[PDB]
Structure 1
């Protein structure tokens, strides 16, 4: 015991959060910059 690599779970969670970031990172930034251009 005490060798379980649940840091793999943390890496998977980080990747999932990095994807949901893309979501609000193309919807926030594009919206704000498009409003500025308009």
Structure 2
């Protein structure tokens, strides 16, 4: 019946699903890399303390 909504429904659907997944990817990357950094900071102090 209506062609343009047929056309753009999944276009917009996937575009915004991927925008949401991009926010998700940046969030997971940020938090996991922060985990990496803080974890290295945690371990280095522990080892240095022990062996000092």
TM-score (norm. length: structure 1): 0.65
Taking the aligned partners of 1:16 and 1:2, their CA distance within structure 2 comes to 21
Secondary structure in 2 aligned to 1:3?
helix
Q: Please state which structure has a larger fraction of its residues in helix.
A: 2
- Pair 5,30 (structure 1): closer, same or farther in 2 beyond 3 Å: same
Taking the aligned partners of 1:22 and 1:4, their CA distance within structure 2 comes to 26
Greater C-alpha Rg: 2
What stretches of structure 2 of length at least 5 have no aligned partner?
1-14
What stretches of structure 1 of length at least 5 have no aligned partner?
none
